[PDB]
Amino acid sequence: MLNPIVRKFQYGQHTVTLETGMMARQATAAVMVSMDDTAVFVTVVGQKKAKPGQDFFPLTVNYQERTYAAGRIPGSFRPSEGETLIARLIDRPIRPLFPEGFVNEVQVIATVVSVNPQVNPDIVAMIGASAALSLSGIPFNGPIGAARVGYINDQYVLNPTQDELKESKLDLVVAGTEAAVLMVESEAELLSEDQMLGAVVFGHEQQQVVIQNINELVKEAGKPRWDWQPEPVNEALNARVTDKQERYLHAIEKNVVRSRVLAGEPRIDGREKDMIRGLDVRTGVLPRTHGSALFTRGETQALVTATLGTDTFLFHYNFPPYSVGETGMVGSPKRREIGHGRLAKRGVLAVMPDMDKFPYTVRVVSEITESNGSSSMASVCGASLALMDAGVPIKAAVAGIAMGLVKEGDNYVVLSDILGDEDHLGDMDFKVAGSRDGISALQMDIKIEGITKEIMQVALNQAKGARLHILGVMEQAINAPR
Amino acid sequence: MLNPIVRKFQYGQHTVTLETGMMARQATAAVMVSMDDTAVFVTVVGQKKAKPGQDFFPLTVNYQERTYAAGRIPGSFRPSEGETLIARLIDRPIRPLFPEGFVNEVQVIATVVSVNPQVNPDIVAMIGASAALSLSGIPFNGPIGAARVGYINDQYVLNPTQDELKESKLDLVVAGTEAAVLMVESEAELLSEDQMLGAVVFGHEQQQVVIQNINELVKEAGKPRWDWQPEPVNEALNARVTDKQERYLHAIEKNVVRSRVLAGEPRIDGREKDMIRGLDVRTGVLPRTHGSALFTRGETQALVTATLGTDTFLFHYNFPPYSVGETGMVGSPKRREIGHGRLAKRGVLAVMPDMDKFPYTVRVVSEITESNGSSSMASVCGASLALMDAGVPIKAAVAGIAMGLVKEGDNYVVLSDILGDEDHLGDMDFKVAGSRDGISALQMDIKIEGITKEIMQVALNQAKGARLHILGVMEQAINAPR
């Protein structure tokens, strides 16, 4: 006899249905999530025992859309770019919630079984993974909420439909727990810092009903929590022990950098907390392409090209191994290229001219020749210069930067233009792209609690000045498209 | 502040520009090479430390053409066959220049950023790899030159354009150092031995200006040479210690074979230095194909088929694991199939009838059933018989052979129809394909100095007789296409 445990709740203009304890019973947990007519079957399998010599935590999130979900039969057609991006939209918020030291293999599989053309399955899958990981018993400090925030008629809209996104000046996706925001992925039409930040708070407050309803479902049908504890801290072994290529467990060396930044001492390369690296802006680097640009920000360089033809706006991103001075594979999008490429696309999509004024298919290819701090934001700067070189009449010039944060108690330091080493060690990756008048793209990845409205407001303010500084240098080289 | 080190020089009818020390600074070296409007960005990354239990030298050459280089946007389209062949045209000359014992991981990445429809990027990429490997500091006994040699109006033409190749009776690509020639890859319209050899000397003499200009660029912007030396020769362990399948470190056993050949003693299988293996020529092996042929040269056999349809001349080459009596994968072109397939295609392309006399699409598939010495040249013999079986009116019958050379001081032995074991141990792989009147294809891979005009002239003369012997046996079976 099969017994389905069902909980329904109102979420904006939709009803979210959660079913468990019936389908896929050999999985650690499995939920059928339905937001109106769109449905995603999410499963989580966590291995009971960790492997002997495991150095990292293996988390694999698999997203897959079925053709039968829309009621279609495939023609002449390995996950697509859209499926990989949504898989990362699930992976990013859930990853830092597994306790420090947890090494067991966990796999999340989300498959779309039904889809309404107006309701996007990406939010449905994120709620499904949040429900499954909480019902499983696997140590997971959730549950998380998922909310898409629009901006129609100067007002924030919770989970706007595909038709409502046409009127919206914002496509922000926010994820986080009851305590603090974890992820943020968005695209905007040059909105101010307060408008962008207000959207993060709006979505985080609205997604609380999702967290509350998963919690109650765990109280009713949740499997007993995994009896797990990390290997105890041994003090006997702990207490006993400018250029990136020249400089680069050393947990103590990682601590020294963190303690130096909080004290107010110069950074690893010698810069201050708000200083930007050496800039080099160039236009017309390649003779046979329509537009070419070579943007350099310290030890981060991008060779960006623009091609005109007769999707209307294509963006490609290449990350070769020689950018970091290493020998790897080529052509294979290492769980990065698709993510950073769409990030850089969202930073440029706002200033792109209308098809009525400029009826041409534009493809932008970014080549990362050097990487030492956010090559995705360097691609945003390079794209703007390459489009102006090609003769593409973009509304305004666009630049991007990456921001870092080290927080200790109530003492926090906002870092401008973070390095490769400064990423791994910070508590918050913070990428802002936009023009002199607004923000086109905003990305957040937070791992700590205590991150509030004010701290994020100061972080955006220092990011705005960092953006305006590069835009000033960019204007000195080129300021108008052919 | 970025400072580009630039050196320009005249090369035939073009100006070759070399830029370094600005783009991709975390790579061991990186050059931007431009021959007129065609540009290839070449990077080399060499690892400082060798891996513990490494048995071979890991060299990976990656060639990739960008669609934005020609100013195009991809439609509905993993490197292509053309990209893999050019990658080998870079790999072949550079490989034997790394000192014996060098085991560190080196990767060469060449990406085409701009392309003139008349200037071929393949020569540009070869010069780029020659410039990068010399500027890096990594132990490399170059620099090498790169030259395409044509034959228009009974005269040799340095780097002929795509329009000039239409008039040319030769498409020879030569590579080598200041001292001696290393590689040679060509396609010809039945040119004599002296005409083919003269082209190798012409190209090697013309490419000296490339070597001279890279040398000066190394004198100006070259990184300090890597302080490297191989593990010393230990005499305590060194002095202490017909059928291919039955017969097959043993550096002493490798030396015994080399010393036997130089002395004048019979080869491993019992043949003399100029003798050819047992030949078996057959026609009409398969009942449902248009033309079929089974060619056997000792322990090297090829099942070659021809298909007629209504690129006009397609050539496919399959190398299954059972050909050597081993168990491997199937369908995966192991860094061979594409190379040997185009080699066998170039051997047959000269005798192929005109589209005016014979307006049909012809596909030739070669199946290597046995392999023990140059299955690519056995495919040339098999293709000629399969085309005659299909009824394709080829100008003349075509056969191919592989030649070997052992040189010691001034004493050298030219080997006819080399075995699988005789390849690994020789100093020069030498493949000639053609009819009774000329040479259609000629391939060279030399690893030694002292290789001169006279020695190569004797090597071709013994190769010609070896070719005429097989053609005589081929004529006894079939001599006219249906």
Binding site: G284, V285, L286, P287 | P4, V6, E19, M23, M32
Partner: peptide, 21 residues
């Protein structure tokens, strides 16, 4: 004619600087 940083039509550079308030 040629490719690279040297053949650039437009150029602007700045030393590591603290942005304006």
């Amino acid at each position: 004619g040629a490719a690279g940083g040297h053949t650039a039509t437009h150029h602007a550079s700045a030393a590591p600087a603290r942005p304006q308030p």
